[model samples]
Target: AEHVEIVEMAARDGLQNEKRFVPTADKIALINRLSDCGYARIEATSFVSPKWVPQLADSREVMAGIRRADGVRYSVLVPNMKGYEAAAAAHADEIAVFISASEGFSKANINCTIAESIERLSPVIGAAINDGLAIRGYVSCVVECPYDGPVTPQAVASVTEQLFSLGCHEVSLGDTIGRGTPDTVAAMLDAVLAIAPAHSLAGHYHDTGGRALDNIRVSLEKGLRVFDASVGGLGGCPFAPGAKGNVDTVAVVEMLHEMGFETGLDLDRLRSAGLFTQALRQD
Candidate 1:
């Protein structure tokens, strides 16, 4: 059986874009529920400043309170050294950092140039490595950007390569604006995989254009196995307006199962968690 790893982002990336503050207890409960779904990695929360993303203000609480499952890695998104320190103190099993391939997106989102953003994260990555933690890097705006018209494949490859060279165990290419077709995604992947191995790369595609699954199929054909998805399709980029949530975990799992790919996820349990998350969104 071809094995694929599903990284659940519902608790963190999924809920971060919500306009309302998700209660700490609800966040904890959701994560605990997702833990039962047998995901290889669950992005439990982000250690970003509450002033920036009020939705994930209770990162510490969620991280401290989740009922951790053995063999399931809980990852945290860390924006800087401070975030990394907080994540480490909270016992994050893995740490993730993000940057954009588009200059406009980088400036608008993180308030820095791409080079400066990489510089800022270098120390964080080094610290995580020194502390014996695995680091995951995300390259946003891998395709068309909300700010920049169309990001070139070379731009995507440049950022992806730097992230890997910075000691990131895996680098996920994110089409933050959900503007990629299979053709564009395939082109971007071709460029990125040239500098980095297919195994070192993961795909993070939003479902805004209803093309996420098709893009995933193209990615799978290109030897990419790991993917980042949210439960119930519950997330949008706060930095990218009009962008919808990630490709739903349930939807992705269903597709992979029918395609003979083993994600080691329980469909029933995943659906339950998805339903719960959907309810939270309604609230």
Candidate 2:
């Protein structure tokens, strides 16, 4: 058992861009099952507008319906003020704000520029902080952007710093397109550390290029313990072209256990979690 917290994002990110809508009851049931599995944190839903993401229109129901475990924390992704309002209503345990490192990618993903996106998330962060909620920030397209080509390490660092300054407790740098290699991951970590300490950072790598584990190794060397992984590898960026899914939780946990790290996750349970989500993905 590895002694790290696995932030499970499959319930939200894994299902947001889905074409076939899974019923809210089913989603609640799935989350309820995961709650029993002892995941440290579970991303239960996204509070985006229904017009933008029809699949997640049932965010409130999902949050309200899921059974909560005592020690496990639940979180959600909020796009703007309206989303934050819904999150507050649903009583989300924690909240995450997202931004893109590249201007083009930011506009494509959120319909705004880098600065505009940060300005947008700041108020939401303020509201959450006022409510005494923990905030985690996401900086997407840290390595490569489909619309604008390669993204720089500096872009990630700047946005990460801005997020932390805006009161986010932690920032997870996402290689949204999964075009990052170990070298790129190391360089980006170096850049982020230049502004914030490594302990305040996390990694959210996609396996679009089969390098997610390699990137994890690089991150571990930098003292990163927290990671955002999807069960069954069931997530992708709607804006990042050709990106597949997240690093499989089973794979990440297996590797961590072999290396004598502490994740507090059962390999069998992780595999079962993946299998459960995999079955849903197939449907």
Candidate 3:
């Protein structure tokens, strides 16, 4: 298949950093708009402990309020067992979890070591599987971490492999600060592909470095077809000070179409949806 998969991120990761609490109805409207844009999966919300990201404290409500469009799998992120229970109770269509590849990042953000983070997620992943929810995983700081400095590809592969062993159907590699260029991105993929095939991996590149597109080209050449992009590029990682957020969906889709790949997305409609989410950042 010459098709590529672009997971929309605006409803959750895209809005996680907003200083203002985006209204629940507005978040629903934003998601509902994205639902019609022909995405197979939408990362609709996160069930992580609200204390870390207070902007999305309404995760439960956001899940219950959205009008589920037929053919779309809405995914909610859960970090621990409690998050899993909440997501299950809300009847999530899928479950997502994450851990950083660098121990420095793990301790700095989640207040734990990489080993501890992986262990905590072990039971959550098993339970989500037991409950019949397809689980996906994310590895933060694939290339560089603000706290840990440079990270090796082997480290990333180890974290990614563990997540897969825990039953993650797919794992997304996050370039946390988005400082990766082609060489760095290539090296990481080279090592990760050794343990997991490209089809089972997705690239979650942030545009903070203004080189996401370049890094993406490397991923494409490495046989990757799945990528995570936020509509309008709305959110940034609080862990990386003065950083940009996930790469914008419009840009990713445009590049994919121009490069002669299929994404099953309507570009014009996606633009309008992006416009709506962009305005939500304002009063």
Candidate 4:
């Protein structure tokens, strides 16, 4: 946590893969709870078509229902112009767009070619920037693509650069299928840094391979400062063939504190939120 700012992805990434239908009310409540736990950024929901991601189809209601906490940044994912329109109508504080470096994964995950996805999101990014909303971009399948074989670090770096050039304030590089190890993470970051500034990049590691923390450690040495996480590892990937959830935020924070790094996060409250979610998952 030396220079890390945790971007809570529970609202969108975590809930999208869930088996149960987490009611909009419950999702809004969860956002408020996370805000109370001192998570400054909460990715609230996705403004995607219900046909594609039915889980978060209640984007409008969820966006309207959540009580916006003062000083807490609320973000959501917008897949295209329509998604951005809906999100803007719902008054989202920020929006995120995603693209995959692998053409195959891009086609499978978003039903479009990588080039097509970028073209489609151009207006979304421009609109969000014009509306005075912060835009965070995501590059999934940074290490391994579910549809393709291994992705090169150059691929990741190129896609990251495109996102930044498209006006994203920061872009998160996601290990969607979670097959990356420490060496691969380091290799990827080394390449990504060539095109992206250290402060403009973030880590989004899945715990599927149980190496999320190690990957984070490697990324840390490369000067990355932001991370995307969930609590109790509650969310899994809907697109990754055999993917799991994100690195648990409480676990990551605990590890950071032990290392004498300053996260400025309220561990006690965050732990309680994790415990509450753990019990919820059990039930």
Candidate 5:
């Protein structure tokens, strides 16, 4: 069986932009439950400005509380040096950095131009690699940007290449708007794959348009083996404002297994973990 790696994002992206505060204790429990489900990595929290993402204000507490699994790596998202320092203090098992492929989304979301954002991340990536932390990069709006409209394939490839040059071990190409079709995804992957190998790239497509699975099918054919999925579709796009977030972990895992691939994830336990998060958001 071809082994695929799935990165769990329930604790970070799943709760980062939610309206109601997810209690620290509940967050810890959800993470612990996912730990038992056999994911290789779980992005537990972010060190971004709590002022901007208040729901994740208790990031440190969640990190400290989760019972780390034997083989699972815990990752934390850091927006800058200050955030990196905070994550370092918490002993983040892995580091994650992000940039936008589109200039408009870059300015609107992170308040910087595309090139300027890369410039800012240079030090952060350098520091993480120097400190022996495995740093992963994320490129948002790989295909369509809400503010900038359609993004070109080379634009995605350009930023992804920069991240790799900056020392990122893997770069996740995100269709942040959940609107990319097979044609759009194929075109974008064609460009990105030219500069980097499939093993070092991942798909982080949202399921707002119910096309995430189809997108994954295309990604698989393109030789990508890693993906990012949230439990219960826990987060919505901050700009779009809804319940749809990252594609669901349960769904992705199931699809992967049915296609003769192995992810080492237990679907029954994963479904319970997904239910756990959805319950928190519903009430």
Candidate 6:
């Protein structure tokens, strides 16, 4: 399909950073609403330890409660084998694991080195593959890291390559702190594209620096068709200091449509979903 793919992450990634806990029913409602907006994939929740992300503690319930829409994949972030087991038990259609490109950020974020995080995820990846489940990988700090500035293209590519080798069907390269400009992001993509096919990667950009859309343009030119976005800009990384929410899905869809690309999304429905999520933050 020539249409660009937008994977909605508002319910999981968007709500993960919230200080006040969003009720499980509200989370279910939001995901159910997003499902109707024509998203082929929705990141419903995370199976990580509640100690770290208390907001998504009701991961199981949210996954079990939603009225799943047909043909839409519901994915969850799993940090380790335990999380993977939980996801498997909940019957997740897909599972995602994330790692940082920079050593400092990796250590601070997950209390492990880049190599260690990969080692930890290896078993989980093996399990998911054995279970015949689809896998998604996330590489954070692909551009600039809060602890370590300016991650090299080589560094990002190295981590991305390993994730692909581990059987991840797709890898999402994240500009976690949203500091990437077109020039910088293109450089990162240049390195990654050499090792991983463009179609196997997704762009997950933050809008904090106001350069996400510009960065997306560079990515589209580089042949990246899939992207990860939050509705109404409702997410941030708890690990990335001062990080803001992801690029808004409504804005991305509007731009893609204007640019003559098909995303197969209902703009009116997407805007409605965005508005619904945006109100949750205010409550």
Q: Judged by lDDT, which candidate is best? A: 5
Candidate 2 residue-wise lDDT, 34-86, digit = tens:
77766878989998878888888899988888887868889999999998988
Q: What is the lDDT of residue 22 in candidate 5?
A: 92
Better of 2 and 3 by lDDT: 3
Candidate 5: worst-modelled 10 consecutive residues by lDDT: 236-245
Q: List candidate 4 stretches off by more than 4 Å.
A: 238-244, 279-283
Residue 270 of model 6 has an lDDT of: 84
lDDT (Cα, tens digit) per residue for candidate 1, span 156-188: 999888888899999999888788999999999
Q: Between which residue pairs do clashes occur in model 3?
A: none
Summarize candidate 3's per-residue lDDT along 251-271 as a digit string, tens digits. Answer: 999999899999999898899
lDDT of 6: 0.90
Q: Is candidate 1 or candidate 4 better by lDDT?
A: 1
**Higher-ranked by TM-score: 2 or 5:** 5
TM-score against native, each model = 0.97, 0.95, 0.97, 0.95, 0.98, 0.97
Worst 10 residues of 4 by lDDT: 236-245
lDDT scores of the candidates, listed in order: 0.90, 0.85, 0.90, 0.84, 0.91, 0.90
Q: Best TM-score goes to which candidate? A: 5
List, residue by residue over 140-231, the lDDT tens digit for candidate 6: 99999988899999999999999999999999999988889999999999999999899998999998888889999999999999998988
Which TM-score value belongs to model 6? 0.97
Model 5 TM? 0.98
What is the model-wide C-alpha lDDT for candidate 1? 0.90
Candidate 6 residue 108 C-alpha distance from true site, Å: 0.8
| lDDT accuracy of residue 5 in candidate 1 | 89
As for candidate 4, its clashing pairs are none
